Amino acid sequence: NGLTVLPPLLTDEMIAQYTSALLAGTITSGWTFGAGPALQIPFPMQMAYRFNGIGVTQNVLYENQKLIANQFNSAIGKIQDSLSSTPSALGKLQDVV
Amino acid sequence: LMSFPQSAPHGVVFLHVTYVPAQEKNFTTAPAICHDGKAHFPREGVFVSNGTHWFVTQRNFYEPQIITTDNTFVSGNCDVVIGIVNNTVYDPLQPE
Numbered sequence: 001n002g003l004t005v006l007p008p009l010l011t012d013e014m015i016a017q018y019t020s021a022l023l024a025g026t027i028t029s030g031w032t033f034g035a036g037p038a039l040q041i042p043f044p045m046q047m048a049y050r051f052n053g054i055g056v057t058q059n060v061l062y063e064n065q066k067l068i069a070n071q072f073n074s075a076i077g078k079i080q081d082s083l084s085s086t087p088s089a090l091g092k093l094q095d096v097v
Numbered sequence: 098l099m100s101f102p103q104s105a106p107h108g109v110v111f112l113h114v115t116y117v118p119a120q121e122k123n124f125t126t127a128p129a130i131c132h133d134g135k136a137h138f139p140r141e142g143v144f145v146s147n148g149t150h151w152f153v154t155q156r157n158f159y160e161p162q163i164i165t166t167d168n169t170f171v172s173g174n175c176d177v178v179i180g181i182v183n184n185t186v187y188d189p190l191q192p193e
Contacts, residue, residue, distance in 0.1 A: 036117045044128060059138050059172035062128050065179060
């Protein structure tokens with residue numbers, strides 16, 4: 001009846017590549033890649049910079065990096081658990097579609 | 098840094114003067130320095146090494162400075178921090 005849906009310009013693969021590039025730049029350069037050229041930096045130092053930005057001294061991170069990494073891994077696991085537990089996480093996109 | 102507005106027909110033009118770094122170089126870094134069996138952490142700089150010595154510089158501009166007591170603060174011992182290296186710490190009171 002004339003209703004034609006056009007595909008988007010950037011496919012799912014290109015969006016995934018953009019997301020992976022964003023993630024790699026974030027984990028390898030912090031915020032330097034967004035302002036200009038990417039500058040490599042260890043991720044513990046990036047976390048120390050973030051803690052200094054939120055008003056926490058970096059020694060608290062350099063003394064509890066192990067616990068912080070464990071908590072981060074547990075939170076990442078719980079995120080996937082919540083995503084697989086109920087489809088209400090993407091309810092906004094589902095309602096749009 | 099700063100922006101300058103400009104009048105335009107049915108609009109406005111901002112001249113965003115921004116700071117863009119360039120000419121970067123690779124340096125060896127360490128999370129902390131251990132001299133008197135105690136951990137040292139930079140207050141605002143970052144520990145860097147040019148292969149021969151260790152210096153403290155800004156996180157946005159290369160400016161090597163001697164690792165002094167005024168630039169670092171002690172917090173805990175060395176065996177807790179992972180990746181800590183051994184290097185002497187300068188003290189301005191010692192020459193006097």
